Amino acid sequence: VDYPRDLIGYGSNPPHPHWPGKARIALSFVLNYEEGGERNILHGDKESEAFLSEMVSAQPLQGERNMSMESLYEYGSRAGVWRILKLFKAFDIPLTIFAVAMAAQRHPDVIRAMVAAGHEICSHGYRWIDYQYMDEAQEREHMLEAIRILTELTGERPLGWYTGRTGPNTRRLVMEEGGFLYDCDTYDDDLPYWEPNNPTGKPHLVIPYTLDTNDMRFTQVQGFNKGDDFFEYLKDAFDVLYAEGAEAPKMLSIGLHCRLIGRPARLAALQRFIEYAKSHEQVWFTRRVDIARHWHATHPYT
Amino acid sequence: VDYPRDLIGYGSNPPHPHWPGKARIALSFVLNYEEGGERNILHGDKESEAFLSEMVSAQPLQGERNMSMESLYEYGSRAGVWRILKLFKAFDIPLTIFAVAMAAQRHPDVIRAMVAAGHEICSHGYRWIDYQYMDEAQEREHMLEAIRILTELTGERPLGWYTGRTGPNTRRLVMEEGGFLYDCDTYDDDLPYWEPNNPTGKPHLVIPYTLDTNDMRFTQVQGFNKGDDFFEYLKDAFDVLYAEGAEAPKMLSIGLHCRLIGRPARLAALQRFIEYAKSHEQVWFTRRVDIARHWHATHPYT
Amino acid sequence: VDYPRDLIGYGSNPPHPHWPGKARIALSFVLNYEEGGERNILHGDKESEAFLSEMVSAQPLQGERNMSMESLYEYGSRAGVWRILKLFKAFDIPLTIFAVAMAAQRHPDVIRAMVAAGHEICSHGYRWIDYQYMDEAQEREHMLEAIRILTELTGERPLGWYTGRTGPNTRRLVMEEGGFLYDCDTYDDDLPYWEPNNPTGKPHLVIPYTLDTNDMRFTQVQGFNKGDDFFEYLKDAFDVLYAEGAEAPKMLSIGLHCRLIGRPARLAALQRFIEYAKSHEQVWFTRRVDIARHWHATHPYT
Amino acid sequence: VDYPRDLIGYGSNPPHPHWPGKARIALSFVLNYEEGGERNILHGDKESEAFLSEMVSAQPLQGERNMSMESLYEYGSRAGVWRILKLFKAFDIPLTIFAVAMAAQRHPDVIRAMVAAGHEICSHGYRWIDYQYMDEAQEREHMLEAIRILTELTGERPLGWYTGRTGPNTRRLVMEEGGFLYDCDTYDDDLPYWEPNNPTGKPHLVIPYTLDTNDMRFTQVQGFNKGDDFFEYLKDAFDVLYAEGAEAPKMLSIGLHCRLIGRPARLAALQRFIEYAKSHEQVWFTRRVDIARHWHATHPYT
């Protein structure tokens, strides 16, 4: 029937990306910047934050502040962020930053640092909250606001979007806005593709993200006990994709959070994966906007 | 008393299967095909899907679409399925496909591919949902429909059944239908056996399945952190059974899901287990319908 | 105040057990036999079983049968039990069986086998259910019944007790009954001790059990991914205790369940631990009734 | 806006601690002493304890005693505590004890032992309960009481505080009391810092604690399967911090609980980490009050 999902996509025939330097794989390291934008009555929310912290079994507290939860988030913005940024600078690997606009407003100096470092600032929404149930009017308003904030902060408007906890209208509103080159609000492929259902009809690129090669699993019910578990997980993902890349190259995202991989216990394994990746020839270490411009120039929208 | 369960089965005296090629073990690799058939208001369900995805702590959403959940499922049908099918083709190992009829209707080309590859299409029900509470009338109707769909799709009716989340009537309805050679809706033995309580009185073979040597544990609360955990789990299962097989051969199922082992990070470990298994002599790599026909010819129903 | 718990016990001065053969450690392997006695409307319960199976996130179903859950339990009594019993017979290690009386009634042949093998049959209660909220009258009645059943089944009354999910009266009722040598309904020490609060005033020995060196963790939210995790856990427990045993020997329990360690994937690691343990001199492999009689003869109740 | 959190802290410019012996890292091993102070109707609570035990999926029981839960806690005070104290004595490493005042009242002999051993007794609150919702009046009263108890018990008032499950007023009340040198009710940095918002205006030192390099994860939903997982986690944390310490030394806390790392299976890995740490030059093994006095003398409050 007139089924609004594409279960098929490229089928058994995915396109060759032709990554620069004849790369057998494209690696997109992504650093989320959410600290200061999460759930909090201080921010006008009805409850405290519970998602993604050391407090693995936390529940949101209605009309309350959860001090421990707040403090675990402050680790991300106070200490984790700088240690991570230094690590990427040390191996000369660029980042795409998934920056929440309210978080960035609260820490403009680190955002400025990131931009000066040459990292791409991608929009991660106005607030770090669940958009599942929000009215279309308000989600659109948050969106246009996130754009305003990041443009002023950065001096350049965001060209990609990623909400994460999206609702039924999130991605439609992104493509309707007009000014995005891409979005990342899918986990459906190993390659970019042109959105098949853009009402706008303009080319809109989808660059799928990840929930599995993602440090969020360090704090979820099912998830890595020690750093080496995340290293072996990342390593396996690389090995299979790199092997496929001998004839059919693909991409791999690596999701990271300041308050999570920022802890020394977890950073070690990220550095190990980076050294592993760097030891291979034909790896394209890149930003998602660069993948997007590359797609345009290589596989233009027909 | 007149207890409707058989807690005893074969007791301390299990039969020798006499697998072809004097195999010390029979390996049944199974690939579930559920993507497109899962919970969704689009499919007429009251809520979204929450079982078996990267969103380890998901809950069903009433009257809502969960876009992320949908997208994680689309990974299975868009990308995972082809990579898995290639892996099995590369080692010349046949599959039994646990194909959900609605999922197959949404992707007939992949089903046709599987059949052309020589994989057995086993019925996994009309829909991928919990049958626990469904009225007998409707479950029977789903069943006869699943049969209709797969016969047209495949050109041959399904000879095995597996629902998974069965209710008190599921298995009785399967045996009452008449045309199945076997079912897999048990986790009670290491060997096939004839159903002791078939009202039909015709021979009905039970080929027990698994929830432990099953990639579903990658996304459950208790479950594998990294691929090597699933490899060592599978390897241990093999080692003990193979050792028993010197005098008393048995079988082992390996359950797989497109949207799960389809991810590169997880495929590596499956390939490692396959290489391990292949390095042993006297291993029978087979389909469940072949086990069933073998049982008939070897241990006829008395 | 008049605090009904002993937080202190032996303090920094635990007694030397003087295990036979000058053992530096006493190992108590325990095999639970619960299959056939668990929650089930068939057994007169209000709901199905959910504790300790592959269905890691199961909930009890009110007025329903959970067929999968039943089938996972049937694995324990049909297949797991024999494989485990063979393993212990192969290394000549004796068991204490934690036998639920209703489970034993449903499978008398395996109970008879265990007794003929020389394993101790310890009482694990009439039913495998939570006694937390049961009235004293009914719990006492279950208890006297469990005794009746096992005596007839075995030809000798049970000399130890272990309920597991006890209520505020469980242990008091056990000691009031009179005929038990010991109970195991604590997790409070590394050595046996005489119950300090027996109203009876007769000597009653407490032999603490375990929830950590216990295969139940294979199916709990926090718990072993692969067999080697349970092997390394057991190995570490052994190493520290054995080292302490150079001057101050203690004991270690290893809890096992037919439907859990009975799976080949998990048995491998148990066999590895047994081989490790066996490779050490001065290890006392024993039954809990033997520890109890030893305590009597070695550290009589003053 | 006038946002009551400091998301920024030291920014990219953390101070050099100048640890004694030119240490590249400061290690604070912490032993919680909570057993006897946890939730219990015996203690006047409305429900039993459920946090941090082998009963990984426990829920609090209203108006009930949970005997197993109690017994698992008694392991901590009866057996775990002495084994842990011996381990630290063997490597000549000092502890900071996070002692709950009610727990200490129930076991004065072990507290006296700890003090005689030269370990610092830090206040962990009057009771081991959640202060999230307690009225300010009662939390203040608990606090002044915890102080009274520990001073009498120890012969010296506590100079640090740590509640853990704090409410919106906990830390403010601590600094208002006047007599504390520091608190540990944050998880926001890798270095001590002066509280920027002390109403008192006196210098108050914050020495951040941890929920990740903490044996509590052995019994949480996401957490270590085997001891080596905690060893590798601790080792990684050390390696990254020690490497940073070549130019910019920091500190690392290691949280421990008697009833958890007290089990032999878990102690092994703690001993392994201690041997690893000890094998490095320039490691400062210290107590938190010593870090605090050092901070005063080295980075006085301006």
CATH at C267: 3.20.20.370
Phi and psi based region of residue A282 (left: phi greater than 0; alpha: psi -120 to 50; beta: remaining): left
Q: Which helix (H) or strand (E) holds A3?
A: none
Question: Are B225 and A229 an interchain contact pair (Cβ–Cβ within 8 Å)?
Answer: yes
Q: Which helix (H) or strand (E) holds D174?
A: helix D170-177
Q: Are strands D205-206 and D182-183 parallel, antiparallel or unpaired?
A: parallel
Size of interface A-D (CB pairs under 8 A): 129
Helix (H, G, I), strand (E, B) or coil at D131: coil
Chains in contact with B, where contact means 3 or more Cβ–Cβ distances below 8 Å, are A, C
Residue for token pair 């009662």: D138
Between the alpha carbon of residue D208 and those of residues A74, D28, D120, D162, the distances in Å are 11, 11, 17, 10
What is the Cα–Cα distance from C226 to C236, expressed in whole angstroms? 16
Whether the CB-CB separation of A48 and A65 falls below 8 Å is answered with: yes
CB atoms within 10 A of CB A132: 17
Question: Are C109 and B232 an interchain contact pair (Cβ–Cβ within 8 Å)?
Answer: no
What is the Cα–Cα distance from C287 to C93, expressed in whole angstroms? 9
Whether the CB-CB separation of D96 and D287 falls below 8 Å is answered with: yes
Whether the CB-CB separation of B33 and B121 falls below 8 Å is answered with: no
Whether the CB-CB separation of A277 and A14 falls below 8 Å is answered with: no
Between the alpha carbon of residue A281 and those of residues A231, A286, D266, the distances in Å are 19, 15, 42
| CA-based nearest residue to B218, from B226, B208, B206 | B226
Percent helix, strand, coil in chain A (nearest 5)? 40, 15, 45
Name the minimum distance, in Å, from the CA of D120 to any CA of chain C: 20
Shortest CA distance from A72: residue in chain D: D187
Question: Are C222 and D219 an interchain contact pair (Cβ–Cβ within 8 Å)?
Answer: yes
Smallest Cβ distance to A224: which of B219, B225, B268?
B225
Domain of C32? Answer: 1-302
Helix (H, G, I), strand (E, B) or coil at A67: helix
Question: Are C221 and B222 an interchain contact pair (Cβ–Cβ within 8 Å)?
Answer: yes
Alpha helices in B157-214 (DSSP H): 170-177
Helix (H, G, I), strand (E, B) or coil at B263: coil
Size of interface A-B (CB pairs under 8 A): 129
Q: Is B171 an 8 Å CB contact of chain A? A: no
Whether the CB-CB separation of D72 and C211 falls below 8 Å is answered with: yes
* Bridge partners (DSSP) listed for residue B26: B251, B284
Instruction: Show residues of chain D in contact with A56, CB under 8 Å.
Output: 217, 220-223
Shortest CA distance from A63: residue in chain D: D133
Question: Are D226 and C224 an interchain contact pair (Cβ–Cβ within 8 Å)?
Answer: yes
Tokens of C277: 């343990």
CB atoms within 10 A of CB C54: 24
Q: CA torsion sign, A234 to A236 to A237 to A242?
A: positive
Whether the CB-CB separation of C57 and B220 falls below 8 Å is answered with: yes
**C125-154 burial, b for 16+ CB within 10 Å, e for fewer?**
bbbbbebbebeeeebbebbeebbebbbebb
Question: Are D8 and A267 an interchain contact pair (Cβ–Cβ within 8 Å)?
Answer: no
**B77-110 burial, b for 16+ CB within 10 Å, e for fewer?**
bbbbbbbbbebbeeeebbbbbbbbbbbbbbbeeb
| CA-based nearest residue to B268, from C36, A235, A302, D67 | A235
Instruction: Give me the DSSP letters along A128-159.
Output: SS--TT--HHHHHHHHHHHHHHHHHHHSS--S
What is the Cα–Cα distance from D286 to A41, expressed in whole angstroms? 38
What is the Cα–Cα distance from A67 to D164, expressed in whole angstroms? 10
Entry resolution (Å): 1.8
What is the Cα–Cα distance from A37 to A125, expressed in whole angstroms? 9
Instruction: Give me the DSSP letters along D136-149.
Output: HHHHHHHHHHHHHH
What is the Cα–Cα distance from B262 to A255, expressed in whole angstroms? 19
Whether the CB-CB separation of B160 and B184 falls below 8 Å is answered with: yes
What is the Cα–Cα distance from A261 to A52, expressed in whole angstroms? 12
Question: Are B252 and C264 an interchain contact pair (Cβ–Cβ within 8 Å)?
Answer: yes
Helix (H, G, I), strand (E, B) or coil at B27: strand
| CA-based nearest residue to C187, from A28, B300, D79, B197 | D79
Size of interface C-D (CB pairs under 8 A): 129
Question: Are A11 and B266 an interchain contact pair (Cβ–Cβ within 8 Å)?
Answer: no
Between the alpha carbon of residue C18 and those of residues C11, C189, C251, the distances in Å are 19, 17, 11
What is the Cα–Cα distance from C21 to A227, expressed in whole angstroms? 44
Tokens of D103: 């727990």
- Straight-line distance from the first to the last Cα atom of chain D, in angstroms, rounded to the nearest whole number: 25
Instruction: Show residues of chain D in contact with A54, CB under 8 Å.
Output: 187, 211-212
Burial of residue C8, with CB atoms counted within 10 A of its CB: 0-12 exposed, 13-18 middle, 19 or more buried? middle
Tokens of B72: 């994680």
For helices A136-154 and A170-177, angle between their N-to-C axes, nearest 10 degrees? 50
| CA-based nearest residue to B198, from B176, B181, B179 | B176
Burial of residue C90, with CB atoms counted within 10 A of its CB: 0-12 exposed, 13-18 middle, 19 or more buried? exposed
What is the Cα–Cα distance from D230 to D215, expressed in whole angstroms? 7
Burial of residue A247, with CB atoms counted within 10 A of its CB: 0-12 exposed, 13-18 middle, 19 or more buried? exposed
What is the Cα–Cα distance from B80 to A182, expressed in whole angstroms? 23
Question: Are C7 and D66 an interchain contact pair (Cβ–Cβ within 8 Å)?
Answer: no
* Bridge partners (DSSP) listed for residue C284: C26
Q: Is C224 an 8 Å CB contact of chain D? A: yes
| CA-based nearest residue to A90, from D237, D13, D243 | D243
What is the Cα–Cα distance from B140 to C162, expressed in whole angstroms? 45
CA angle (D204, D210, D215) in 5-degree steps: 140
Amino acid at B117: A
Question: Are D5 and A75 an interchain contact pair (Cβ–Cβ within 8 Å)?
Answer: no
Whether the CB-CB separation of A20 and A187 falls below 8 Å is answered with: no
* Bridge partners (DSSP) listed for residue D255: D30, D214
Helix (H, G, I), strand (E, B) or coil at C174: helix
Burial of residue C6, with CB atoms counted within 10 A of its CB: 0-12 exposed, 13-18 middle, 19 or more buried? middle
What is the Cα–Cα distance from C71 to C58, expressed in whole angstroms? 14
Tokens of A279: 């030891």
Smallest Cβ distance to C222: which of D64, D66, D220?
D220
Whether the CB-CB separation of A264 and D231 falls below 8 Å is answered with: no
What is the Cα–Cα distance from B94 to B114, expressed in whole angstroms? 10
What is the Cα–Cα distance from D227 to D224, expressed in whole angstroms? 7
Instruction: Show residues of chain D in contact with C244, CB under 8 Å.
Output: 83, 264
Chains in contact with A, where contact means 3 or more Cβ–Cβ distances below 8 Å, are B, D
What is the Cα–Cα distance from C28 to C43, expressed in whole angstroms? 31
Name the minimum distance, in Å, from the CA of D271 to any CA of chain A: 18
Whether the CB-CB separation of C193 and C9 falls below 8 Å is answered with: yes
Whether the CB-CB separation of C198 and C175 falls below 8 Å is answered with: yes
Question: Are A213 and B265 an interchain contact pair (Cβ–Cβ within 8 Å)?
Answer: yes
* Bridge partners (DSSP) listed for residue A62: A47
Helix (H, G, I), strand (E, B) or coil at C94: coil
Question: Are C61 and B168 an interchain contact pair (Cβ–Cβ within 8 Å)?
Answer: no
B178: Cβ contacts below 8 Å, ≥ 6 apart: B200, B202
Whether the CB-CB separation of A265 and D237 falls below 8 Å is answered with: yes
Query: What is the tally of helices (H) and strands (E) in chain B?
Result: 10, 9
Question: Are D9 and A226 an interchain contact pair (Cβ–Cβ within 8 Å)?
Answer: no
What is the Cα–Cα distance from D208 to D96, expressed in whole angstroms? 14
What is the Cα–Cα distance from D67 to D48, expressed in whole angstroms? 9
Residue A144 backbone dihedrals phi, psi, to 5 degrees: -60, -35
Whether the CB-CB separation of D168 and D144 falls below 8 Å is answered with: no
| CA-based nearest residue to B276, from B238, B226, B249 | B238
Q: Which helix (H) or strand (E) holds A183?
A: strand A182-183
Instruction: Show residues of chain A in contact with D173, CB under 8 Å.
Output: none
Shortest CA distance from C251: residue in chain D: D264
What is the Cα–Cα distance from A197 to A81, expressed in whole angstroms? 37
| CA-based nearest residue to B212, from B192, B193, B188, B195 | B188
Which B positions 2-31 lie with beta carbon below 8 A of chain C? 3-12, 14
What is the Cα–Cα distance from C26 to C238, expressed in whole angstroms? 10
Phi and psi based region of residue D52 (left: phi greater than 0; alpha: psi -120 to 50; beta: remaining): left
Residue A71 backbone dihedrals phi, psi, to 5 degrees: -65, -40
Shortest CA distance from B251: residue in chain C: C264
Strands (E), D1-91: 25-33
Question: Are C168 and D67 an interchain contact pair (Cβ–Cβ within 8 Å)?
Answer: yes
B66: Cβ contacts below 8 Å, ≥ 6 apart: A132, B48, B49, B50, B58
* Bridge partners (DSSP) listed for residue B47: B62
Q: Is A207 an 8 Å CB contact of chain B? A: no
Q: Is A57 an 8 Å CB contact of chain B? A: no
Which D positions 63-82 lie with beta carbon below 8 A of chain C? 64-68, 70-75, 77-79, 82
What is the Cα–Cα distance from A215 to A261, expressed in whole angstroms? 7
Residue for token pair 């001891």: D227
Name the minimum distance, in Å, from the CA of C138 to any CA of chain B: 22
Whether the CB-CB separation of B52 and B219 falls below 8 Å is answered with: yes
Name the minimum distance, in Å, from the CA of B187 to any CA of chain A: 23
Smallest Cβ distance to C225: which of B164, B188, B223?
B223
What is the Cα–Cα distance from C289 to C295, expressed in whole angstroms? 10
Q: Are strands D193-194 and D160-161 parallel, antiparallel or unpaired?
A: unpaired
Residue A52 backbone dihedrals phi, psi, to 5 degrees: 55, 70
What is the Cα–Cα distance from A218 to A227, expressed in whole angstroms? 8
Burial of residue D151, with CB atoms counted within 10 A of its CB: 0-12 exposed, 13-18 middle, 19 or more buried? middle
What is the Cα–Cα distance from D150 to D156, expressed in whole angstroms? 7
Chains in contact with C, where contact means 3 or more Cβ–Cβ distances below 8 Å, are B, D
* Bridge partners (DSSP) listed for residue C252: C27
**Alpha carbon D195 to chain centroid distance?**
18
Number of structural domains chain C divides into: 1
Name the minimum distance, in Å, from the CA of D271 to any CA of chain C: 10
Which B positions 249-278 lie with beta carbon below 8 A of chain C? 252
Which of A78, A114, A230 best tests the D interface by mutation, with the highest count of D CBs <10 A?
Answer: A78
Instruction: Show residues of chain A in contact with B269, CB under 8 Å.
Output: 236
Tokens of A237: 């993902």
Whether the CB-CB separation of C62 and C47 falls below 8 Å is answered with: yes
